Amino acid sequence: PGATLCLGHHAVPNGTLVKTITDDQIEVTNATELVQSSSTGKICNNPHRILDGIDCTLIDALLGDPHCDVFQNETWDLFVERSKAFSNCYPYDVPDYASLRSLVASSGTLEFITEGFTWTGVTQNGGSNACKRGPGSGFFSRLNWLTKSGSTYPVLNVTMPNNDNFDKLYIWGVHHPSTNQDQTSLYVQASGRVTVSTRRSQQTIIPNIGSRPWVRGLSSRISIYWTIVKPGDVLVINSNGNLIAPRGYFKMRTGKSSIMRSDAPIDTCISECITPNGSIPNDKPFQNVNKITYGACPKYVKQNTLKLATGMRNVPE
Amino acid sequence: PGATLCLGHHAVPNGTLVKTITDDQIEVTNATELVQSSSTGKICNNPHRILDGIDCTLIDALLGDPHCDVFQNETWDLFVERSKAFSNCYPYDVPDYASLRSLVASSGTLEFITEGFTWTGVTQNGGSNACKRGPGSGFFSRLNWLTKSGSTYPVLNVTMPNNDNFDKLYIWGVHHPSTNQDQTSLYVQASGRVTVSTRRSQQTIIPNIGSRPWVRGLSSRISIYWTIVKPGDVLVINSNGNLIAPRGYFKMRTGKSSIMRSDAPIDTCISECITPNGSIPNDKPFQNVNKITYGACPKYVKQNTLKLATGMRNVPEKQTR
Amino acid sequence: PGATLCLGHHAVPNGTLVKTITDDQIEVTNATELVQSSSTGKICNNPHRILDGIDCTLIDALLGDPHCDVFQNETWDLFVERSKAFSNCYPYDVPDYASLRSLVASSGTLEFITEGFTWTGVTQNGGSNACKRGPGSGFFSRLNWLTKSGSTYPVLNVTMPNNDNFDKLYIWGVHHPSTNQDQTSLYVQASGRVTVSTRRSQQTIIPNIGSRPWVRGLSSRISIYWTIVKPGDVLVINSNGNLIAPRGYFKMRTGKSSIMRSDAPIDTCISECITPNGSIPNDKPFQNVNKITYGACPKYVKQNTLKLATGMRNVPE
Numbered sequence A, C: 001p002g003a004t005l006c007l008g009h010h011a012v013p014n015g016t017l018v019k020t021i022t023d024d025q026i027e028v029t030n031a032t033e034l035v036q037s038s039s040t041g042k043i044c045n046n047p048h049r050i051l052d053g054i055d056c057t058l059i060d061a062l063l064g065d066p067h068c069d070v071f072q073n074e075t076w077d078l079f080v081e082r083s084k085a086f087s088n089c090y091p092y093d094v095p096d097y098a099s100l101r102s103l104v105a106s107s108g109t110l111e112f113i114t115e116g117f118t119w120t121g122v123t124q125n126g127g128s129n130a131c132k133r134g135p136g137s138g139f140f141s142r143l144n145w146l147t148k149s150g151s152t153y154p155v156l157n158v159t160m161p162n163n164d165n166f167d168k169l170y171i172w173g174v175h176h177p178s179t180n181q182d183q184t185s186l187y188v189q190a191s192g193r194v195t196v197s198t199r200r201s202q203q204t205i206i207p208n209i210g211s212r213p214w215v216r217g218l219s220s221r222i223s224i225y226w227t228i229v230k231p232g233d234v235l236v237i238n239s240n241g242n243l244i245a246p247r248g249y250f251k252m253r254t255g256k257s258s259i260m261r262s263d264a265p266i267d268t269c270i271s272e273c274i275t276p277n278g279s280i281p282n283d284k285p286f287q288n289v290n291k292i293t294y295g296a297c298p299k300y301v302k303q304n305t306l307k308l309a310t311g312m313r314n315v316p317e
Numbered sequence B: 001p002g003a004t005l006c007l008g009h010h011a012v013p014n015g016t017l018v019k020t021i022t023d024d025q026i027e028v029t030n031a032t033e034l035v036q037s038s039s040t041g042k043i044c045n046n047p048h049r050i051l052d053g054i055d056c057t058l059i060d061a062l063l064g065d066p067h068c069d070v071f072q073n074e075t076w077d078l079f080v081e082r083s084k085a086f087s088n089c090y091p092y093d094v095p096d097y098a099s100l101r102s103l104v105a106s107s108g109t110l111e112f113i114t115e116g117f118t119w120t121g122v123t124q125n126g127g128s129n130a131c132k133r134g135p136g137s138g139f140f141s142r143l144n145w146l147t148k149s150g151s152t153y154p155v156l157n158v159t160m161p162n163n164d165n166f167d168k169l170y171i172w173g174v175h176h177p178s179t180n181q182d183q184t185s186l187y188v189q190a191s192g193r194v195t196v197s198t199r200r201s202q203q204t205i206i207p208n209i210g211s212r213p214w215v216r217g218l219s220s221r222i223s224i225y226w227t228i229v230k231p232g233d234v235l236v237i238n239s240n241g242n243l244i245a246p247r248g249y250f251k252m253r254t255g256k257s258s259i260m261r262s263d264a265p266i267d268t269c270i271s272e273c274i275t276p277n278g279s280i281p282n283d284k285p286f287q288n289v290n291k292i293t294y295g296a297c298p299k300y301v302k303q304n305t306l307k308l309a310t311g312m313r314n315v316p317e318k319q320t321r
């Protein structure tokens, strides 16, 4: 009178399909998802310092558009620019806008240090009704619009050495008048010139008189440029007209800072990974939410699902 | 007297060598090639719309070099530029030629819409014997060479708003005269200026008088620039001399369009994948024909062969010879 | 009284840890290192031709800064630029410095061929005490500083066709005077212009008068430009002032040549792979020494060690 001893394994009534070397679909007892495909829709305000630009681009906060004055000296790990942002100061362009935005974003600070530039024989603090600050005309807070004093605008020739142990970022510009009358009325000379240099490098910009499209009452424009001055080097600014002068420099840093375009609201929560769609968990190695990310994130892939088998082959009965 | 039952497997007289984790070469019963290494030498005319440039670069077709007039308003999935292409109009350069070529190639169309620009106090439709159109002097079809009327060239100041819901591409230029006599003779003012702007952006170009190498009779040149005007924005052109004016705009699109340099002839066949060497099949995952491709193509690799084993190890009977 | 026959395998007392699919660390009898993590600290002078720049950047050797005259017509597989290099001639900048440095580095030669440019009505061979040669003033050896003859500087208009079967590299420049007095004193015309062209392309540079920081006595500058002329094409140079003229061309090659920034000393040894830290062996497939390499090198990875198991699982007694 014997006995039977059967060896076996478990099964489940409803298995999951996975891919292998030999099968595009085969059933196993269990699997887990490796692609993060959803977001909360919200950017968590920890553990990264999130700075909401609201109505302001980083560049407008940098220049000091009056409605962006609240951003003076701000810092961030991630600056968030909104699609509703608008400019409301002198109409301007930045040749290589993208590079200036990038280098400031990456620096992570708008810390500004005022310097005592001496502008001999010119009028300082020019403004416009296109850039109101309170009820009266105004200007970008970090820039100093120089014009004639009496009936002359002399050749400006000034210096600022960098005797600190950090890099200085200087933002400056050039005014493009609408007419010859505007040019001579403001700067006396019929044609201006701005040359900004360090020991190693230089930029010279010739203004261009003429009409651009009307923006906030003006066919004139300002063009924005930048110059980095390293320790031991020196800034020199040289102009006989049309200079939009720096008031000082921005302190530069290196680190983890960046910038992102997103309309996702900011919320009080914790998430290492941020996308423009909102924060996403980072327990999974891959994600299909957005190729734009910031922080400790799963890697972006095209697949919306990939199943890692966590059990044996499911052979039901 | 019992019986013997032997288990076994097949072998074949002619195996193939494959690579594994442990072996650089080991013999299996069969294998299949994963690298496409040959082409027909011909570009198949389907399923993609292939436009043969023949004697014309895309840029010459865009500007409207007379021998390229047949390309007016053309469209393509793949524009094919030939090594025999030549220019035969006013000598010109395009700063950032590569970008203009790229953005037009990618747009996939030369559809041109003429606009009623008003050029007050200048002579229109200037031409050159370097750019013959029929028996007489001519010019790029899409550009309008403005010069003095009587003894004056006034400050030109014109606008064109974009009230459409698509982007407009404007092509314009600046004429560089050979001498001061040429400059004043054509434009009166001793030095010209072209400023083209939108709300957001602006380009100002100062012409430069002097000799460049003689091309079709001329040491002068034209430089070509472009400006995209989005819906709701406006073009403004401002000049007191040397303007080579747009006659209108090109309609821009987005899609699958591109451009390829190839001398391969175009033939009647069907192939998703195109290389400069000709079309190639796409049944294999890899290819070693050319890193330049267009369409549904195998991925370019350096190996000219890679064998995927499709059978077991091939073990012939121990050899008595 | 029968017998026992035990099958077994070897072990060692002290095994090595490797990583697998299932284990972060598991012990095997032996393994071999796949990441090269050390260097000698020295650059081997074979089998690649190493040219030590010493006190000279490649660009200064190219222009012919006097202390770099020893590099005239030199060749290299790898030009090594040292952090102690300095400039000691007219102060200058190169817009797109990085591209000029790259294309020269890649050409692998400073072979210079003098051409008989005819400069009618100007004074040739201008120099400066910022660029001393012998007891007197001097200049970049490969450039010809043109100034007025008598009371005129005429429109210069010269041509040079390329009837060779190689590309010609022309280096030229533009002088930026410190003052209007300097400009008219040297060139007569109040504003200069340099136009350098080939059949298909052209560059025009307007000089900019004004002060830059003092370097070796000077607030003036030279800006350096280049033009490649292919076989069958032709150079034209046209100027009414401020031209720093080429004396000829550099003969261009294509091949394996490059440039590296390193302070590692050069030694007599053999190594295919060079990093800025020094030469490294290339018996391993990966390396963690430096992402900058030249020659037959292991691929750069972030891991400092990766162990390929060369034996079975170690199960000691």
Ligand SMILES: *[C@@H]1O[C@H](CO)[C@@H](O[C@@H]2O[C@H](CO)[C@@H](O[C@@H]3O[C@H](CO[C@H]4O[C@H](CO)[C@@H](O)[C@H](O)[C@@H]4O)[C@@H](O)[C@H](O[C@H]4O[C@H](CO)[C@@H](O)[C@H](O)[C@@H]4O)[C@@H]3O)[C@H](O)[C@H]2NC(C)=O)[C@H](O)[C@H]1NC(C)=O
Pocket (backbone or CB within 6 Å): B178, B179, B211, B212, B213, B214, B215, B219, C157, C158, C159, C234
């Ligand atoms: C600034 O300096 C330059 C260089 O000296 C001058 O440019 C030259 O000017 C002359 C005169 O216009 C040009 O001569 C013409 O050459 C043509 C042949 O061209 C081919 O070969 C040359 C090489 O020698 C290539 O440059 C060119 O690309 C072609 O491959 C001839 O076809 C012309 O002949 C016709 O015109 C002349 C009248 O000028 C008649 O005698 C003939 O019968 C015929 O009708 C002509 O000989 C020369 O090509 C120019 N060279 C270059 C490199 O550009 C500028 O003119 C000068 N500027 C000023 C203001 O002085």
Ligand SMILES: *[C@@H]1O[C@H](CO)[C@@H](O[C@@H]2O[C@H](CO)[C@@H](O[C@@H]3O[C@H](CO[C@H]4O[C@H](CO)[C@@H](O)[C@H](O)[C@@H]4O)[C@@H](O)[C@H](O[C@H]4O[C@H](CO)[C@@H](O)[C@H](O)[C@@H]4O)[C@@H]3O)[C@H](O)[C@H]2NC(C)=O)[C@H](O)[C@H]1NC(C)=O
Pocket (backbone or CB within 6 Å): A157, A158, A159, A234, A236, C178, C179, C211, C212, C213, C214, C219
């Ligand atoms: C536009 O504005 C600028 C700024 O004022 C002017 O440029 C300055 O010009 C002055 C006078 O020409 C320059 O002065 C010279 O500086 C030399 C180097 O200075 C640097 O290095 C020394 C150490 O070697 C440091 O101590 C110093 O901080 C600097 O970093 C000096 O070596 C020169 O010395 C000579 O003169 C002095 C007289 O005071 C004597 O004691 C010496 O023995 C010697 O003879 C001299 O002082 C100055 O460097 C310029 N600065 C800059 C930033 O460029 C322009 O001149 C002006 N433009 C116009 C058109 O006017």
Ligand SMILES: CC(=O)N[C@@H]1[C@@H](O)[C@H](O[C@@H]2O[C@H](CO[C@]3(C(=O)O)C[C@H](O)[C@@H](NC(C)=O)[C@H]([C@H](O)[C@H](O)CO)O3)[C@H](O)[C@H](O)[C@H]2O)[C@@H](CO)O[C@H]1O
Pocket (backbone or CB within 6 Å): A126, A127, A128, A129, A130, A137, A145, A147, A176, A177, A178, A182, A186, A217, A218, A220, A221
């Ligand atoms: C200084 C002054 O009041 N000048 C009178 C001009 O206002 C006037 O021209 C017109 O200007 C209008 C906008 O003007 C401002 C502005 O931007 O708000 C006024 C600013 O004070 C002035 N700032 C400075 C430093 O001068 C500024 C500046 O000149 C321009 O922005 C430079 O491009 O102009 C508006 O554009 C009107 O359409 C226009 O008529 C002139 C001519 O009427 O008279 C001046 O007395």
Ligand SMILES: CC(=O)N[C@@H]1[C@@H](O)[C@H](O[C@@H]2O[C@H](CO[C@]3(C(=O)O)C[C@H](O)[C@@H](NC(C)=O)[C@H]([C@H](O)[C@H](O)CO)O3)[C@H](O)[C@H](O)[C@H]2O)[C@@H](CO)O[C@H]1O
Pocket (backbone or CB within 6 Å): B126, B127, B128, B129, B130, B137, B145, B147, B176, B177, B178, B182, B186, B217, B218, B220
């Ligand atoms: C209008 C005219 O006929 N002017 C005479 C010039 O032809 C002549 O200069 C000669 O020009 C030759 C080539 O000339 C054209 C051309 O490009 O084909 C003729 C065109 O009609 C003219 N177009 C316009 C709108 O003016 C064009 C233009 O001026 C230049 O291309 C601009 O740079 O020139 C060739 O270059 C000869 O070498 C040259 O002598 C002058 C001087 O002799 O006399 C004029 O009567």
Ligand SMILES: *[C@@H]1O[C@H](CO)[C@@H](O[C@@H]2O[C@H](CO)[C@@H](O[C@@H]3O[C@H](CO)[C@@H](O)[C@H](O)[C@@H]3O)[C@H](O)[C@H]2NC(C)=O)[C@H](O)[C@H]1NC(C)=O
Pocket (backbone or CB within 6 Å): A211, A212, A213, A214, A219, B157, B158, B159, B234
């Ligand atoms: C060159 O031509 C352009 C285009 O015609 C001129 O620009 C236009 O200038 C006028 C005023 O001179 C602008 O009109 C203004 O519009 C506002 C509302 O938008 C209105 O409230 C004002 O009363 C005023 O009429 C017009 O917008 C502007 N056009 C564009 C496209 O910007 C330019 O002034 C001409 N310049 C010269 C010197 O001829």
Ligand SMILES: *[C@@H]1O[C@H](CO)[C@@H](O[C@@H]2O[C@H](CO)[C@@H](O[C@@H]3O[C@H](CO)[C@@H](O)[C@H](O)[C@@H]3O)[C@H](O)[C@H]2NC(C)=O)[C@H](O)[C@H]1NC(C)=O
Pocket (backbone or CB within 6 Å): B030, B031, B032, B033, B310
């Ligand atoms: C062992 O592997 C080889 C491939 O390395 C096999 O030969 C290939 O077989 C395929 C599919 O059976 C053949 O495709 C056919 O080609 C004809 C035209 O030639 C076409 O009309 C059919 O519709 C079909 O696509 C292919 O020709 C052939 N390729 C080569 C390079 O030989 C072989 O069949 C395998 N043998 C065994 C015994 O498994």
Ligand SMILES: CC(=O)N[C@H]1[C@H]([C@H](O)[C@H](O)CO)O[C@@](OC[C@H]2O[C@@H](O)[C@H](O)[C@@H](O)[C@H]2O)(C(=O)O)C[C@@H]1O
Pocket (backbone or CB within 6 Å): C126, C127, C128, C129, C130, C137, C145, C147, C176, C177, C178, C182, C186, C217, C218, C220, C221
């Ligand atoms: C070809 C030539 O003119 N060489 C001059 C040179 C140039 O005029 C100058 O570099 C152009 O910018 O100037 C040299 O002078 C330097 C010296 O000039 C004095 O006038 C002034 O007192 C000083 O401040 C200083 O600039 C030079 O060495 O560069 C002389 C040279 O012969």
Ligand SMILES: *[C@@H]1O[C@H](CO)[C@@H](O[C@@H]2O[C@H](CO)[C@@H](O)[C@H](O)[C@H]2NC(C)=O)[C@H](O)[C@H]1NC(C)=O
Pocket (backbone or CB within 6 Å): A037, A038, A039, A276, A277, A288, A289, A290
């Ligand atoms: C995250 O946001 C991106 C960017 O808007 C979304 O991508 C868009 O969504 C659909 C297809 O998914 C398209 O109609 C758009 O053209 C896409 N734009 C881009 C730039 O890719 C994405 O779907 C969002 N993902 C999640 C999970 O919310």
Ligand SMILES: *[C@@H]1O[C@H](CO)[C@@H](O[C@@H]2O[C@H](CO)[C@@H](O)[C@H](O)[C@H]2NC(C)=O)[C@H](O)[C@H]1NC(C)=O
Pocket (backbone or CB within 6 Å): B037, B038, B039, B277, B288, B289, B290
């Ligand atoms: C496809 O064309 C490429 C490019 O023309 C061929 O590779 C070139 O072959 C030339 C000589 O014929 C060599 O000197 C170069 O090494 C190659 N050029 C480049 C740019 O890589 C290639 O062999 C062709 N392939 C086939 C299958 O025809």
Ligand SMILES: *[C@@H]1O[C@H](CO)[C@@H](O[C@@H]2O[C@H](CO)[C@@H](O)[C@H](O)[C@H]2NC(C)=O)[C@H](O)[C@H]1NC(C)=O
Pocket (backbone or CB within 6 Å): C037, C038, C039, C276, C277, C288, C289, C290
């Ligand atoms: C080779 O040289 C590089 C560059 O000088 C060394 O990298 C530095 O070392 C540590 C990381 O190990 C960092 O803190 C530094 O910031 C690194 N510098 C840079 C520029 O990355 C590297 O360690 C050297 N390696 C060896 C083996 O000598």
Ligand SMILES: *[C@@H]1O[C@H](CO)[C@@H](O)[C@H](O)[C@H]1NC(C)=O
Pocket (backbone or CB within 6 Å): A012, A029, A030, A031, A310
């Ligand atoms: C699948 O994954 C884990 C087990 O590691 C667990 O969360 C879940 O209950 C499992 N499901 C099934 C059906 O086994």
Ligand SMILES: *[C@@H]1O[C@H](CO)[C@@H](O)[C@H](O)[C@H]1NC(C)=O
Pocket (backbone or CB within 6 Å): A072, A073, A111, A112, A113, A114
């Ligand atoms: C910016 O930086 C410092 C504060 O640490 C100071 O110099 C300056 O007053 C600050 N400005 C503002 C507006 O906070």
Ligand SMILES: *[C@@H]1O[C@H](CO)[C@@H](O)[C@H](O)[C@H]1NC(C)=O
Pocket (backbone or CB within 6 Å): B072, B073, B111, B112, B113
């Ligand atoms: C190009 O297209 C437009 C409208 O789509 C048309 O008005 C124009 O005449 C066309 N030109 C040619 C040459 O077909």
Ligand SMILES: *[C@@H]1O[C@H](CO)[C@@H](O)[C@H](O)[C@H]1NC(C)=O
Pocket (backbone or CB within 6 Å): C030, C031, C032, C310
């Ligand atoms: C360990 O493996 C390497 C590579 O095969 C070999 O050179 C070395 O001698 C081996 N050492 C031992 C102790 O087996």
